[PDB]
Amino acid sequence: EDPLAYYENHTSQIEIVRQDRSMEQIVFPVPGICQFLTEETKHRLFTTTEQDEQGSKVSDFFDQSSFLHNEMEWQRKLRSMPLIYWFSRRMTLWGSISFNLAVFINIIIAFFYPYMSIRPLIVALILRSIYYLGIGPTLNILGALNLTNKIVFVVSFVGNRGTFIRGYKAMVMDMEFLYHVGYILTSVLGLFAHELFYSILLFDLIYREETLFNVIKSVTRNGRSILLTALLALILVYLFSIVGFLFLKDDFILEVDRLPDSTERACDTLLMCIVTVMNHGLRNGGGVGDILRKPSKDESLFPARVVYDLLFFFIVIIIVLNLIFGVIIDTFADLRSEKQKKEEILKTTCFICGLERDKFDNKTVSFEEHIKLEHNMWNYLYFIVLVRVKNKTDYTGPESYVAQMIKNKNLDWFPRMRAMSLVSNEGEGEQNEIR
Amino acid sequence: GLFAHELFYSILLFDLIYREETLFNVIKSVTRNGRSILLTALLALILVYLFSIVGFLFLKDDFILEVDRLPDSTERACDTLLMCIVTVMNHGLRNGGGVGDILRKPSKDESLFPARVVYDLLFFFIVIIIVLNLIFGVIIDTFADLRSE
Ligand SMILES: Nc1ncnc2c1ncn2[C@@H]1O[C@H](COP(=O)(O)OP(=O)(O)OP(=O)(O)O)[C@@H](O)[C@H]1O
Ligand SMILES: [Zn+2]
């Protein structure tokens, strides 16, 4: 309604650096296409963009400009389609419905197999269906609902994300799409082949919960270290088994509960000795000595047995096994430190210029205004889109300069540790004093 | 405690936490990431459910448990999926060696001996050394974060 309000909303400003290392302020109109940028995509980019070797996110932010433009174009195209857009807007609802259905199906299977808010209402309806129709019909209905809801969720996911915008190859390469396809296949298997396949769907908890994902990362980050420690444990077990087979063959007597003698020799062969050690010594707190024949102090090999058991216990149980847990704790610490560093950087430094919030103290302009009005990464994206959408025939000085810098793949036009609102005022003031 | 039953006085011992700040910080070291601990427990439950399904499908006869009947001494603890899940979730988690510490001892001549060995080893590595230790790792991480803050 208000022309001034409309122009203020559709007008943006940025700061650039020219070839002579001089800072200039450019005021431009926001292209209409820029209005179709999703807040989810903006947040994802802001929280995922990484720093380069020089500590700048500008390289990645610029490299994502084409993807952002294509995503905005796809969103504009989709918004003309009401039904598909409406379905795409409810991805969270579809995912929640699918997860609840999977949980209910798994609970029913656990509590009844073998056989033959609105959540309380859903539970009551499920109980009534079980009482009236039966477990089988209830499971069939739940499986059909889960399959339909997952199909709707996949349609919504593709529509909203525009993964096809990068091509079918990119969509296939995407891990999330493959995960959704595998989930659909698992649901189909549960519905038709055997209901027990529904148990696999419980792994969707990891996908849904980020905290559990971080906990799992604490183990998977140093998975190579864990596997190497396990291999070292296996080598030590092999050596101990060799020693036992050479000198303690008769002490490997194991009780057995034969199905319709009660003891057997478990070290007649090297492979059997290795298997017995690797299993029992590792699964017993006291080590291999907890299953070997109990010796007597009068035996000549009693000191040897004591030394063997003690060495196994100290070397394998207290050290080797605890190394995996130590690696897990170290990974926990490293993840926490990295996350804290990243959050501190993101919250106390400027995305474009990288200046800290401590140069802006005691000045007309604060960090908040500097990030909302002067170095807006989104305003830079809008300027990039304008340069790419504007006919070359009506470029201005700075528009042509930025277009040429883009043609040459040069980022030196983004400011870096410099702000027109920070040092330009004092610089002009000292210049006036000098003059 | 004064009127209904004197045993209610035991609840008053929780005032120690209120009185002592150090114990309160120790409890905070666990309660700060309570959601993480609960999610880890749910993951453990899901893994136990999968292992119980596998055992019921292929190792039904090996779930024999001794019982001290009040005035046969063994019973089958995996005749149903729910019973198998309960037995695993209890014994495997409360035994250092895992679920294998309560299953029937096999013989090397049995055709399923390698399968039993693999099952027990997988349960031990996946659930006992990793999943259970994740809660303790979370507690240690919370300790470190609290001290740093
Ligand atoms: N250069 C930057 N440095 C730090 N944070 C930034 C930067 N540019 C943007 N942000 C933050 O990223 C988010 C994007 O701000 P944006 O102007 O898009 O907000 P908005 O409220 O959605 O917009 P508007 O109200 O102007 O229509 C905000 O949190 C903003 O503070
Ligand atoms: Zn800036």
Author numbering:
A (entry chain B): 2111 to 2226, 2260 to 2403, 2449 to 2623
B (entry chain A): 2333 to 2403, 2449 to 2526
From the paper:
Inositol-1,4,5-trisphosphate receptors (IP3Rs) are large, tetrameric cation channels that serve as the primary intracellular calcium (Ca2+) release channels in nonexcitable cells. Expressed in the endoplasmic reticulum (ER), IP3Rs mediate the flow of Ca2+ from the ER into the cytoplasm and other cellular compartments where Ca2+ contributes to the regulation of cell division, differentiation, metabolism, migration, and cell death. Notably, IP3Rs are inhibited by micromolar cytosolic Ca2+ concentrations, resulting in a biphasic dependence on Ca2+ for channel activity. Here, we collect electron cryomicroscopic images of human type 3 IP3R (hIP3R3) vitrified in a broad range of Ca2+ concentrations and treat particle abundance as a proxy for the relative free energy of each state to establish high-resolution thermodynamic models of IP3R activation and inhibition, which combined with cellular Ca2+ imaging elucidates the structural basis for IP3R-generated Ca2+ oscillations.
In the first of the major states, the BTF ring is intact, ARM2 is extended, the JD ring is intact, and the pore is closed. In both the resting and preactivated states, no density peaks consistent with a bound Ca2+ ion were observed at either the JD or CD binding sites. The IP3-binding site is best resolved in the resting state where Arg568 on ARM1 coordinates the 1-phosphate of IP3 conferring a specific orientation to IP3 in this pocket as predicted by mutagenesis. For example, the abundance of the putative resting state, which closely resembles the ligand-free state and shows no evidence of bound Ca2+ ions, is negatively correlated with the concentration of Ca2+. At low Ca2+, 45.2% of the particles adopt the resting state whereas this percentage drops to 0.7% at high Ca2+. In the resting state, a portion of the wedge loop, including Thr926-Ala943, inserts into a cavity surrounded by the CLD, ARM1, ARM2 and ARM3 and adopts an ordered conformation. By aligning the maps based on the strength of the density for the wedge loop, we found that the flexibility of ARM2, as assessed by the local quality of the density, is inversely correlated with the strength of the wedge loop density, indicating that the presence of the wedge loop stabilizes ARM2 in the extended conformation. IP3 generated in response to extracellular stimuli can bind to the ligand-free channel without altering its global conformation, yielding the low-energy resting state. At low Ca2+ IP3Rs must escape a low-energy ARM2 extended resting state in order to activate by binding Ca2+ at the high-affinity JD site.
